């Protein structure tokens, strides 16, 4: 209903935190609640921060891929930056990255960019996995990936950015996204020849 009464949800979250119920809830339930809170731009971030902190490392250790990506996406859309939640997220990603769908990979990459994630190994290996499975990427997934804030940071190697660029040239058909990708290629650290060829393909 896009209903915005944040006092009611604040009372509900206070009851959730006080009852120590965040240590027994399911991963998909946590993701659904966080996504619902983020979909309406919840105001009181202190309650959400306490609720996310209260959950234990046991839950973080064996979360499935999709609830985990939902949780990190809801964290990113709520402008939450937590130093100790992100290390748990990173080790869980290290464990279960191979099962991510392409749209999950794009969501993870752009959400981690949106929160200014400082780790580079996890980002680099996620980008490598995305490059390996480039032949299956849809249109919305490419928009989500190449629409990330610091996308040019991730376009480090030619191997990790060649199939993604050719797939974007083949599939993406929006002038603004192509211009943004060309600008990111210009600001990237790729070899000059590949940048020139990709810019030629995308624009013109």
């Amino acid at each position: 209903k896009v209903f915005k009464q944040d006092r009611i949800l604040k009372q509900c979250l206070d009851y959730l935190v006080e009852s120590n119920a965040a240590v027994k809830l399911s991963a998909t339930s946590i993701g659904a609640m966080l996504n619902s809170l983020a979909a309406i731009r919840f105001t009181y971030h202190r309650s959400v921060k306490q609720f996310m902190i209260a959950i234990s490392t046991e839950q973080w250790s064996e979360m499935d891929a999709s609830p985990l990506v939902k949780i990190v996406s809801a964290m990113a859309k709520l402008s939450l930056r937590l130093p100790q939640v992100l290390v748990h997220v990173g080790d869980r990603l290290l464990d279960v990255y191979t099962f991510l769908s392409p749209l999950d990979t794009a969501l993870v990459i752009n959400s981690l960019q949106s929160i200014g994630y400082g780790n580079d190994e996890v980002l680099m290996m996620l980008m490598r996995h995305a490059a390996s499975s480039a032949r299956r990427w849809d249109e919305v997934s490419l928009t989500l990936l190449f629409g990330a804030s610091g996308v040019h940071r991730l376009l480090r190697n030619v191997e990790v950015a060649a199939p993604l660029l050719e797939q974007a040239a083949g599939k993406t058909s929006s002038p603004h996204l192509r211009q943004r990708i060309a600008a990111s290629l210009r600001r990237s650290a790729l070899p000059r020849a590949l940048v020139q060829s990709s810019t030629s393909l995308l624009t013109g």
Partner: peptide
């Protein structure tokens, strides 16, 4: 299978395991 006799059982029960395998957002609400 006739022995099931129209009883889905645990595979079609309401348990948390079966309720934790879908991504609908629980928006409309049962």
């Amino acid at each position: 299978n006739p022995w099931n006799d129209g009883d889905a059982g645990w595979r079609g029960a309401a348990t948390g395991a079966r309720a934790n395998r879908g991504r609908g957002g629980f928006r409309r609400g049962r």
